[PDB]
Amino acid sequence: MELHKNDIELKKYNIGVAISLGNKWFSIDNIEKLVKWSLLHTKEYVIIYIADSIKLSDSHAEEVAIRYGRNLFIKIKERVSLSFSQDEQAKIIYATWSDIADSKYKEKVKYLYNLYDKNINFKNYIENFVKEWVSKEKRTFNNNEINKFGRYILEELPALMVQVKARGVLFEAYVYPYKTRITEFVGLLQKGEIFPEIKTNILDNHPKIFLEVRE
C-alpha cells in the first residue's frame, strides 16, 4: 500500500481520504488502509469525507450524508478506535458535507451550476460524462436522470479541484486508489486546458494534489 513525490515523505501536506460511497473498492478494510497510509505520510491531520456518490434535501451530497454517510462514519470510527492509538485517532477529522460546503465553497458550486445551465457545450460534456459511467452498468437511465446526475458531479467538483478547509483545517492533498475519468478531467481543468473559464473564475493557483495510493 504505497504511493504510485519527495514532499510526501517530507510530510508537507495534510491528506484527505476521498471515499466513493458504494464503490466496491471502498470496503471498510480498504478505507482503514488508506487511513493508515495517510496518518503516516501527513503533515498533521487526516480528513475523511465522502467525495462522490455514484427527497430530504435540496442538495444531493447532503442527502447522501444524512442517509448513508453517517452510518459509514460510525463504522469507520469503531474500526479506527480498535486499530489505532488514542494519539493517532486525535489526528483524524470526519468531515461531513456540511463541514466542507461552507460559504466560499457554495459560491464555487453555484458558478458551475450556472455554467451547466447557460453553456450547452459544458452541459453536454458533463452529460456525456455520466453516460459513459452508466454504459458500464447493466442498469439504464433516461435523459432527465442523466441530467440530474450531471448536476451532482458539479457539487463535488470544487473539492477535487481547489484546496478547501474541513472544519477550519486546510488539506492540500487527497488519496484515491486509481486514476479515473474525473481525476483526468480535473487535471485538465486545473491547467486551463479544458473549459478555461472555470480556472479563471473558481480556481486560484493552489491546486488540489491527487495522490494515487493502492496495493
Structural features, described:
Helix content is 55%, strand content 16%. With 215 residues, it is α/β, with parallel strands linked by helices. Helix 2 links the parallel strand 2 and strand 3. It has a single domain, classed as Rossmann fold. The radius of gyration is 17 Å and the shape is globular. The chain is built from ten helices and eight strands. The PDB classes it as ligase. The entry lists the keywords Cyclodipeptide synthase, ligase. It forms a monomeric assembly.
Give a quick summary of the entry.
The protein has 215 residues and is of the alpha/beta class. It contains ten helices and eight strands.
Number of strands: 8
What structural category arises from helix and sheet content? alpha/beta
Distance between the first and last residues' Cα? 4 Å
Quick one: overall form?
A: globular
Give, in order, the helices and strands.
EHEHEHHEHHHHEEEHHE
Approximately how much beta-strand content do the residues carry?
15-25%
Total domain units: 1
CATH H-level superfamily title: Cyclodipeptide synthase
Number of helices: 10
Under CATH at level 1, the class stands as Alpha Beta
CATH architecture: 3-Layer(aba) Sandwich
Describe the largest sheet: 6 strands, mixed
PDB class: ligase
Keywords: Cyclodipeptide synthase, ligase
Assembly: monomeric
Entry title: Crystal structure of a cyclodipeptide synthase from Parcubacteria bacterium RAAC4_OD1_1, E174A mutant
Annotation keywords:
monomeric; two-stranded antiparallel sheet; alpha/beta; ligase; Cyclodipeptide synthase; 215 residues; Rossmann fold; monomer
